[PDB]
Symmetry: D2
Subunit: 319 residues, 4 copies
């Protein structure tokens, strides 16, 4: 390969720029040339491409978001979209593509290979819900963002002896809520991958009140439901002064943590190695603490799960 492309698609995540930086630096060290695609898939169609020099990626390792931007491109589900895209590609003589993003982004990389455009996917999401990897780029960062909030909430919850329901991100995966809850020392964690009984939850809170703890923290993954409904329920059933906080999009931004920076550097470098060595239609990840690569097709057919033992431990550590 003489020339590759790199794009970010799906919801941005902290560490995407460190990823971009390794793709660009890896490729060039190898003498290959890198072209950035702006606005993700949508930009790819609109032929929104510009070469990236080694310095275009200096001073970005520590920044959140993506300097390549991102957008929702429904028009790419289409053979027409895909054609227009493949055209744009060829028009710049971009031979290969590194896609950094969600799973909606992986599908696109799949479709592109089926049309003979070698693509490698890099998992960038705060969610951790991407098959093929233990951890996605941006998850560690989001986690630290949430525990930052929890730490703060804890101060005021303590002061006023109140119960707080904190809604975190992950529409389909409980990683954020699970790791957060654990690290935060939350009395209750509601994730989608585990059954919960509101009676039990209540029982445990009352019991904790008794054991002398007047404040309490409850984490709820948006996937399960609304922070407001649980707060309402919890308050009606215990009589505790209850407050609800929805973290929101703060979970998406910020300067990536060291782990997210090391992870994104390693994975972005690897994706380039695959393109050169001709492997295409692969997705990178980290499993059992080792750098791996899978067929997108077989990884996409795979499912996202959480360590139920971790979830259990959560319950044993609550007072």
């Amino acid at each position: 390969m003489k020339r590759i492309g790199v794009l970010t698609s799906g919801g941005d995540s902290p560490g995407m720029n460190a990823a971009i930086r390794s793709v660009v630096r890896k490729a060039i060290y190898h003498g290959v040339e890198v072209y950035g695609v702006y606005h993700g898939y949508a930009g790819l169609i609109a032929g929104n491409i510009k070469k990236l020099e080694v310095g275009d990626v200096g001073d970005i390792i520590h920044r959140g978001g993506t300097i390549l931007y991102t957008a929702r491109c429904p028009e790419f589900k289409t053979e027409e979209g895909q054609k227009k895209g493949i055209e744009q590609l060829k028009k710049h003589g971009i031979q290969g593509l590194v896609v950094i993003g969600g799973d909606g982004s992986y599908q696109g990389a799949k479709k592109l290979t089926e049309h003979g455009f070698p693509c490698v996917g890099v998992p960038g999401t705060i969610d951790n819900d991407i098959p093929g990897t233990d951890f996605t780029i941006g998850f560690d960062t989001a986690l630290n963002t949430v525990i930052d909030a929890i730490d703060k909430i804890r101060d005021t919850a303590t002061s006023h002896e109140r119960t707080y329901v904190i809604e975190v991100m992950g529409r389909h995966a409980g990683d954020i809520a699970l790791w957060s809850g654990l690290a935060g020392g939350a009395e209750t964690i509601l994730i989608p991958e585990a059954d919960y009984d509101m009676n039990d939850v209540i029982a445990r809170l009352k019991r904790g009140h008794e054991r002398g703890k007047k404040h309490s923290i409850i984490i709820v993954a948006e996937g399960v439901g609304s922070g407001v409904d649980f707060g309402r329920q919890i308050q009606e059933a215990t009589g505790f002064e209850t407050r609800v906080t929805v973290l929101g999009h703060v979970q998406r931004g910020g300067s990536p943590t060291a782990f997210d920076r090391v992870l994104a550097s390693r994975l972005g470098a690897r994706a380039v190695e695959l393109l050169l060595e001709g492997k295409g239609g692969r997705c990178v990840g980290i499993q059992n603490n080792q750098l791996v690569d899978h067929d997108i097709a077989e990884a996409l057919a795979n499912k996202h799960t959480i360590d139920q033992r971790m979830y259990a431990l959560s319950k044993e550590l609550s007072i």
Copy 2:
């Protein structure tokens, strides 16, 4: 004086512990003895008092919340409440009282002096809405908490080219939203002390879109209204992809900033100086960068205002 008391009332704020620490250390250096009142006014009634040794206040300067707790005590509006309180006081031979808290807390200190219990108020609120001081204890901290959020939001807003409405605290004062907005480089700030015309707001956003900025940040003080209503309005009228974030109680917790720590140390020390020197029914503050003290009565009759010139500047700095 041989023995004083210290309490925290109203919503907790970062820096209350540094305040507690200076009251305790100041007093003892002076050979006076300090008694802590737990759960604020409510605890004062229930005679929830315990002496504080010099070391009871070691390792708290950097902690948020208040180690004395706080509670809402409606029963204190009452002569009966006030009696029960004054009784409890005398029963421990506590001669004077340092009250750290909101204005609801100042009233209580007023009522107590009218019954001959020398009280000095210390402004502790994230709000900055307390007459008699340029700055209250906890405001700087809350500010840094909000800009922390804004910084994050900015990353994702940039990435996806979206408009964000961020709701911050202050039910009656726009300090948080004003300083935040300014420091955050927000395109629009909605505070209660300034008239706004939704048409103009819109005009400025569209105009900014034109000048080439595809993302935008709007700050709204809860006092003005709901982040959701403005978001709805802004989106309907511009067609911009709009998202809303409510910061909530995270604004209340955290390890106080250096300024909040220096401020709370200085003011808590001063309040003790007043008690000893017999001045009672006073409130402390910082005005024109100098340590001052006022009659609670005349400070409570005074009103809270913001620097309108600062608000103006906000508009000139928006692209």
Copy 3:
């Protein structure tokens, strides 16, 4: 005025970019045009100037350092330097100059006015040692950086029951060490503006050891001397397990705090107001919490002092 210039000189400080941003935005709102001077004075000589558009200053409010760079320019002490500079100025038709920086930078602004080039100085230093202002741009930020370190040191000092000597910046002013020490709850603060007796320092440490506190934190402004000498002295005279930490240049970088951002916005805006209204050879500041401006000459003839009462309080708050 139709066209102004802006430069940063002396040691960079967090908040310089927010300053740059207000100068650029203020001026343009006023219809004036802004030219950036790169590498400070040195760049000014080498005619290293480039116009700044409204967007050249978007996304910098939150960044540390200065996008204009800075350098040491000894050659400017010279009439020749000054000529070459004034030439460069005129060659671009830049009529006025906003200088952001230390006092070495103010002198240069003085010399420039004496040659009829209207200049306004903006105080940018982590030091706080600039006459004409209570606070300089970057001081609050440096303070939060130091207390961040102190907080950490406290954890390990506590764990191991050790004494730590922490050297902070300020070669001629004790502001950093004084505010830090206070906010940090340091047992001892050594600043240059106050006499200290090593015997007393020792006495207080031993006494504190006795009162039951096994760890201790000592802050020393580089101006007084080396962290290593004091550590050596303190250890030899108490027998306490002593460790020394030199913070260094970390004090200079980072994303400016809210206060530093609001301060730099307000002051940079003001400096522009002065240039337009013809006032030149002035320096801006904040005194008694109000925006002021002075003649550089009379402010430079003035001296930097610290609130000795604050220093005293430091001693009364130590256990």
Copy 4:
């Protein structure tokens, strides 16, 4: 088992309290009783033990250092020490021991089992240099602390176009410097496990200067040598304006990161599981992202290594 003990020994690390918290909560859930040993081994000798109730470990998950303190106990190398210790143990009827700490701490746990006192070791060090685990408790935290510094240094290094040598901790392992350097986007990393040639280092810096980058960051693990010697060397050989910063003990303190909190919770819980189930003389860890346990003897005979491929990548990512 009816009663266990828990201690912290060696240099404190962020996450030790979260570890303490899981040991205490795990054990009690299991109906076993926990006794804390203060001042590590030294305290164990001096019979400095006190039971720990479920609430003694509330509000510590987020704190750095160790609420159990730690000390250097040379006297424990001794059969006499060990006897005095085993005596103290029995005198409280403490049957098992959870040791959290360095490897110096593991030896002690070994010696204790050889005397029939079932002990389980938990890896707590900022260093990551402990065999039997991919990661030790406190490493992630130290990493984030260093990149925090690097980020700051980068701002000032950029502003002034200078080269900085940053000395980090790890006397025998390069993990900190390696991960830091990578995450920090350092131009050079000097670790002990890899050969370096000062000529090459120089070559790369000059070359980078050429490619247009005027600032540079160099990380050096204390293990390799002094930041001052390298700075001196680098400056003499390039002519670049060079500055040196030694991070020091700040690397040891702070509120543990989410990963350090989850890791310490999981491992501390596991160590208790081993004690109950009779396994003693084991050490816990995380390998290939799975919770494991080893014989202390065979893990101590094993060696600490770094991923050389990671080190390589470091070089390919430098401009």
